[PDB]
Design a binder for this molecule. Structure first.
Ligand code: MG
Lengths: 40, 185, 226, 88, 214, 133, 45, 422
């Protein structure tokens, strides 16, 4: 051990990757949310 | 030296560390359970990529510091990224865009997932020193160095058009190498 | 024909490359000088940087032809443009064994305690106060002082007094107001109204010789630049 | 002002260490060290195409560098050629 | 305005005009003693003194561990410290290769003889009244001088020499004829330290206690 | 020898072509979690371009697109700035090339990497040549 | 304006001095300085 | 016999002015600094023949000058303000768009109170409060004497703003670190005047960061102003040194006055507002005409040999040099400000232009009589006072230059009306 290791479960792994700014909720978007259509 | 050779050309992900194998086999299962939307595949791929890169860099730097030599991390990262820059599509989803067995880039796969709605499933594959070099955009030099038999056969069968954007390609050709004084623009 | 050969090779760069090209600096460019013999003469620093061996290391000599090759060899492949290793940035051209031994003998000094005096000095002069380092080197060349003999060199109040965080051993504060601060390596004579009158340094000829040679090299380079 | 310093100055001027300083000084205004090489090569080619034998004192690259150093306020010899007057 | 308060070390709840004080900067402190008007600014007044961290406006009362003069006395200042030359990092094309600091630790205030001016044709210094100013303890005390010279008070105070040793804690007044040249004391201290180190190294051998030091 | 021959052949097409790929992501290097000793934390940041401004109260130590020297690392370890975002080859936007800001400072001359420098061959050689000893 | 040295200078000291002179003066000055240091060291040895 | 040169009238400056910089990494090639009654100036001491490339005459390092960025994160590349000092709260509490001289003035005041700093030794050569030509250090009498209402109002507003900033930031409850910087309210005004009259905006690059900042550079503020400059500032990023380089192709002889361009392409009012300087040959000063008469443009440019695009007008000497000595910046500014008409290649009618020139002349006469004084009276007043205030001198020179520009426009209109019929 004694190295950089993410947690075992995913719930706190998400807060860990949000702490290191690897991924965030502002990066979740598809063509729908980007081009802004509502008939889908 | 054998440690460096076996951590660079990964025979299996559990050979370098069983913790990494356990973490990956937990990540993929728990990210198929929850977040079934392509965002789940995306976040799982990103997490696996980050963990694999960090672990590989740490192991290489530890095996280098144990002997007394000092090497900067950028040289290691340049190779580590090329080791784990490609993703592998699973064998259960087939469409007119991609085949079940393919090795596509990570950024291309993520952008296609953000673009296309068709079910696209991909899992991060850790290539090796030899395996990653056998799958390149050129067949003259970077592919025809080890086999020289099938890398030419498949290229002639597909009719591959190779753009001379490399160094050894132009070395074998004989023209000016696009590095340094040859790099125009 | 030899005169014409010299006139041709006066300013034509030549490339030297060892047969085993293990390191990245194995291929360098030099300016050829006509020498008599059957062996290529190279600089000791470049030889140490090119992994010199006890056995005879074969050297391949290549001569560029085109103008572009000559410009690239003169502006990029010279040794004075590549002195830092690309691994982390450490100087690849460092003084060799003999140079390090010479520098260590110069800057080592000599004995200071029981090895220089037999009995305790508490019961009972050094070399005269040399106003300039030139006089010290001249006295050393005249064989009047030894290389390890301590001396006092008048320092021109440069205020760059190199020492450690150690208070002076004694401060002779007289009645008129001029007190002498005696340290382990130097002496500061200070008047009443906070004025550094004199500064004397207790050192040998090797330290001042090295300092003078480095300073004079810097100054000569700066002057020849103009 | 060190009195005994003329010997190494003459050694610098004679051995040819002035060019090593001039190249480093000229590489202080250019971003890429490759475009500078290309420009010097092009200028040398243009100067050797006009007059073949009259490329300078001995060569053209040294002539181009001397011309570039003389236009900045630093007097340099013609193509960095200074023969030894003490050769019998 | 002349103001004196309790001896507790805390703020005075106001600020003082530094134009009427002496600013004696130390390593980790700075002192302020009131200055009465005078041609040459050397007259002190130890009735009012303030301590403050370096470059700050938080004034406080220092620690007094000796009886202080209650009258205008003419003194002279002399610092006692050691230079600290460090090798700073170079992240510039012409970054300085070295850095020099004085790092004063003690300040000595030697009272003049009979409060005479420096321009007096018969000027002298009184070494029996020396006030040190510590920087680590924020204290200002007196110097336990040891006057060892034949003559007593009838001896003229023009042939004297204050020798300071032991990190500014030992004071001795001796005549200027029996002084020691710097090389002598340097060699003495070096010889003592070298002999101590040599006896340490050899003590760890089995042939000790049956040997001789020649 | 074989290890160097393989490592060079792995990365050859990586040549600095652009000045700024335009990325807005950076790796987070912290001493409390990533680098237990101080020497490793210093060696990781030398020659790296910052990805986000490092603030200390209302004053900024260093802004984006700024190289990091030993002085900046000393200021960081003195002011106790744990979250540090730097630009690395991992956060670049291409696998066939890298930009000047993602690579950083070249140890050969001491500034940004000039366009057209074969960083891949240099990396392969600098990783292979220490393997002999 | 170089630092005056009064202690022994080993290989690491020379390496650090050269690394600092390259950053303070440049490679042009450092080459001549190293050449003169080599000459003096050979003479002394 | 001594050579008669424009630099020979002045005497050589103090050698300490160059000695305090030569101890640092400062060099001055082929230049000689000379002090006179107006102030210091930079002259040439060597004939510079027409060069193919630029030649450097000054090398000013970065560690000798102040620098504050123009964007929101204020980064001082020469790090002289330690973290925690309360002066950064004064620098930061400013609008990042309208007031940039306040931050430079505060940084200069702090540099005046920091040891081992170059500006503690260079401050002895800066102009005092009596030899400065800025209008911040002026009185109400001189501002009313300017005979310009808008400029006087702007200067009064700026003085008020300076005083209000000093009163709001330097209050009584301030710690002593800030109070000792500017004890009197005149010190801050002088600091603002120096920061406003000697600032240079230049895009500098250090390491990998390329930003634009406002920097007060020493030995380069001595360069005078000229609308036909001879030198320009260049930033060298390899050594972090600013350079002053002569233009490529221009011939410089011994004794010439080395000059650069301050605010290229600005009106003569902003010059008096910022630098307190006025020039009668300004090729950009605007004269406002309310009349509807329109002169012909192409004929007006052809008669005065003003050949070039409307963005760059120059006098072509090789067309006519001795014949046209009248052609200066004044006629160029006139041709740029005169109401002109042009409809294709239609030739002008002499009657229409002869009727328009008299209307323009009577408009110039009615706008010139608006001033209470005349030209000769101001010309006698300027030399009637041998040693007067610098602000009053600047104001009377401004009025004289305005009147001389009007007279030059009138004379040029006369030359055009009498030379259109060859
Ligand atoms: Mg061998």
């Amino acid at each position: 051990d004694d190295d950089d290791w993410f947690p075992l479960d995913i719930q706190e792994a998400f807060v860990e990757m949000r702490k290191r700014n690897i991924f965030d909720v502002s990066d979740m978007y598809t063509i729908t949310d980007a081009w802004g259509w509502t008939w889908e | 030296l054998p440690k460096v050779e076996q951590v660079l050309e990964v025979r299996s992900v559990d050979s370098i560390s069983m913790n990494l194998e356990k973490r990956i086999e937990g990540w993929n299962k728990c990210i198929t359970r929850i977040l079934g939307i392509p965002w789940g595949f995306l976040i799982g791929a990103e997490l696996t990529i980050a963990q694999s890169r960090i672990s590989l860099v740490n192991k290489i730097q530890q095996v280098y510091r144990s002997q007394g030599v000092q090497i900067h991390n950028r040289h290691l990262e340049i190779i580590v990224r090329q080791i784990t820059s490609k993703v592998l599509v699973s064998e259960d989803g087939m469409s007119n865009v991609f085949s079940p067995g393919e090795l596509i880039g990570l950024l291309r796969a993520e952008r296609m997932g953000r673009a296309l709605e068709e079910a696209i499933c991909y899992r991060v594959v850790l290539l090796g020193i030899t395996r990653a070099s056998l799958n390149t955009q050129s067949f003259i030099s970077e592919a025809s160095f080890q086999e020289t038999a099938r890398v030419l056969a498949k290229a002639a069968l597909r009719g591959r058009i190779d753009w001379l954007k490399g160094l050894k390609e132009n070395v074998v050709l004989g023209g000016v190498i696009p590095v340094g004084t040859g790099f125009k623009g | 024909v030899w005169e014409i050969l010299q006139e041709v090779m006066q300013g034509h760069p030549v490339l030297l490359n060892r047969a085993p090209t293990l390191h990245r600096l194995g291929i360098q460019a030099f300016q050829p000088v006509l020498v008599e013999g059957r062996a290529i003469c190279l600089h000791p620093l470049v030889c140490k940087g090119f992994n010199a061996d006890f056995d005879g290391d074969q050297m391949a000599v290549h001569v560029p032809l085109s103008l572009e090759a000559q410009v690239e060899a003169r502006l990029l492949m010279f040794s004075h443009m590549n002195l830092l290793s690309p691994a982390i940035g450490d100087p690849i051209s460092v003084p060799t064994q003999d140079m390090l031994i010479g520098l260590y003998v110069l800057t080592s000094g000599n004995h200071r305690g029981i090895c220089v005096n037999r009995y305790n000095p508490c019961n009972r002069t050094k070399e005269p106060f040399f106003s300039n380092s030139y006089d010290a080197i001249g006295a050393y060349r005249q064989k009047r002082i030894n290389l390890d003999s301590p001396l006092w060199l008048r320092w021109r109040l440069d205020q760059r007094v190199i020492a450690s965080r150690e208070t002076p051993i004694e401060v002779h504060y007289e009645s008129l107001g001029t007190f002498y601060e005696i340290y382990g390596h130097y002496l500061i004579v200070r008047s009443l109204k906070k004025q550094i009158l004199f500064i004397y340094i207790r050192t040998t000829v090797g330290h001042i010789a090295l300092y003078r040679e480095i300073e004079e090299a810097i100054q000569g380079f700066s002057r020849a630049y103009s | 002002r060190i009195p005994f310093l003329e010997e190494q100055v003459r050694k610098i001027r004679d051995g040819g260490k002035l060019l090593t300083m001039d190249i480093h000084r000229l590489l202080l205004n250019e971003d890429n060290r490759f475009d500078f090489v290309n420009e010097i090569a092009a200028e040398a080619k243009q100067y050797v195409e006009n007059n073949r034998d009259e490329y300078g004192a001995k060569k053209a690259i040294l002539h181009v560098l001397s011309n570039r150093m003389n236009d900045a306020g630093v007097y340099r010899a013609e193509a960095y050629m200074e023969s030894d007057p003490f050769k019998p | 305005v002349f103001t004196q308060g309790w001896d507790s070390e805390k703020i005075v709840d106001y600020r003082i005009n530094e134009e009427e004080f002496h600013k004696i900067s130390l390593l980790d402190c700075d002192f302020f003693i009131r200055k009465p008007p005078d041609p040459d600014n050397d007259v002190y007044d130890f009735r009012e003194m303030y301590v403050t961290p370096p470059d700050t406006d938080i004034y406080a009362i220092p620690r007094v561990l000796a009886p202080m003069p209650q009258k205008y006395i003419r003194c002279a200042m002399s610092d006692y410290g050691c230079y600290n030359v460090t090798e700073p990092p170079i992240d510039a094309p012409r970054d300085p290769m070295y850095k020099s600091e004085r790092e004063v630790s003690k300040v000595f205030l030697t009272k003049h003889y009979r409060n005479r001016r420096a321009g007096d044709p018969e000027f002298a210094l009184d070494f029996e009244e020396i006030y040190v100013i510590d920087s680590k303890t924020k204290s200002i005390t007196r110097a336990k001088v040891v006057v060892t010279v034949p003559g007593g008070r009838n001896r003229d105070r023009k042939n004297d020499l204050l020798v300071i040793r032991d990190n500014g804690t030992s004071f001795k007044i001796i005549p200027s004829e029996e002084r020691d040249d710097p090389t002598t004391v340097i060699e003495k201290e070096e010889w003592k330290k070298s002999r101590q180190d040599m006896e340490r190294h050899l003590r760890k051998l089995r042939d000790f206690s049956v040997s001789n030091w020649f | 020898g074989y290890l160097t021959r393989r490592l060079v052949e792995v990365v050859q097409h990586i040549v600095v072509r652009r000045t700024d790929c335009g990325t807005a992501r950076g790796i987070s290097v912290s001493p409390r979690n990533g680098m237990m000793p101080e020497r490793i934390f210093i060696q990781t940041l030398i020659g790296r371009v910052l990805a986000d401004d490092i603030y200390m109260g209302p004053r900024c130590i260093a802004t984006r697109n700024q190289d990091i020297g030993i002085g900046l690392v000393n200021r960081f370890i003195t002011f106790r700035a744990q979250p540090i975002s730097i630009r690395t080859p991992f956060t670049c936007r291409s696998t066939s090339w890298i930009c000047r800001l993602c690579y950083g400072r070249s140890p050969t001359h001491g500034d940004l990497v000039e366009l057209g420098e074969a960083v891949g061959i240099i990396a392969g050689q600098s990783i292979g040549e220490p393997g002999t000893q | 304006n170089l630092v005056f040295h009064n202690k022994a200078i080993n290989g690491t000291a020379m390496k650090r001095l050269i690394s600092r002179l390259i950053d303070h003066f440049g490679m042009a000055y450092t080459s001549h300085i190293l050449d003169q240091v080599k000459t003096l060291g050979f003479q002394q040895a | 016999q001594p050579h008669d040169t424009p630099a020979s009238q002045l005497e050589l400056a103090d050698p300490d002015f160059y000695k305090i910089g030569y101890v640092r990494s400062f060099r001055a090639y082929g230049i000689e600094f000379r002090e006179g009654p107006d102030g210091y100036g930079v002259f040439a001491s060597r004939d510079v023949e027409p060069l193919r490339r630029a030649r450097v005459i000054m090398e000013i390092p970065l560690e000798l000058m102040l620098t504050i960025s123009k964007k929101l994160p204020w980064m001082f590349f020469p790090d002289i303000i330690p973290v925690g000092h309360p002066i950064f709260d004064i620098i930061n509490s400013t609008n990042p768009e309208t007031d940039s001289d306040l931050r430079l003035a505060c940084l200069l005041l702090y540099a005046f109170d920091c040891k081992d700093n170059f500006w503690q030794l260079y401050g002895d050569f800066l102009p005092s409060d009596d030899e400065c030509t800025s209008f911040l250090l002026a009185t109400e009498e001189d501002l009313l004497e300017l005979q310009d209402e808008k400029l006087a109002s702007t200067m009064r507003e700026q003085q008020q703003r300076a005083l209000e900033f000093w009163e709001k930031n330097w209050h009584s409850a301030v710690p002593l670190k800030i109070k000792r910087l500017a004890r009197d309210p005149e010190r801050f005004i002088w600091a603002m005047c120096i920061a406003q009259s000697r600032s240079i905006n230049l895009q500098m690059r250090i390491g990998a960061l390329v930003q634009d900042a406002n920097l007060l550079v020493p030995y380069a503020d001595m360069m005078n102003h000229s609308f036909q400059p001879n030198c320009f500032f260049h930033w060298r990023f390899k050594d972090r040194m600013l350079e002053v380089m002569i233009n490529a192709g221009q011939r410089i002889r011994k004794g010439d006055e080395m000059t650069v361009d301050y605010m290229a392409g600005q009106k003569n009012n902003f010059f008096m507002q910022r630098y307190g300087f006025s020039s009668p040959v300004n090729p950009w000063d605007v004269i406002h005409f309310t009349g509807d008469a329109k002169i012909h443009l192409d004929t007006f440019l052809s008669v005065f040999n003003i050949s070039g695009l409307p963005g760059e007008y120059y006098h072509n000497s090789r067309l006519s040099n001795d014949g046209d000595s009248f052609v200066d910046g004044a006629i160029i500014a006139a041709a740029r400000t005169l109401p002109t008409w042009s409809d294709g290649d239609l030739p002008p009618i002499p009657s229409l232009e002869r009727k328009a020139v008299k209307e323009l002349q009577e408009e110039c006469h009615q706008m010139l009589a608006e001033f209470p004084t005349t030209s000769d009276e101001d010309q006698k007043i300027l030399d009637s006072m041998p040693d007067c205030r610098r602000t009053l001198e600047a104001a009377i020179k401004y009025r004289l230059h305005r009147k001389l520009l009007i007279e030059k426009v009138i004379q040029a209109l006369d030359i055009y009306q009498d030379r259109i019929l060859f």
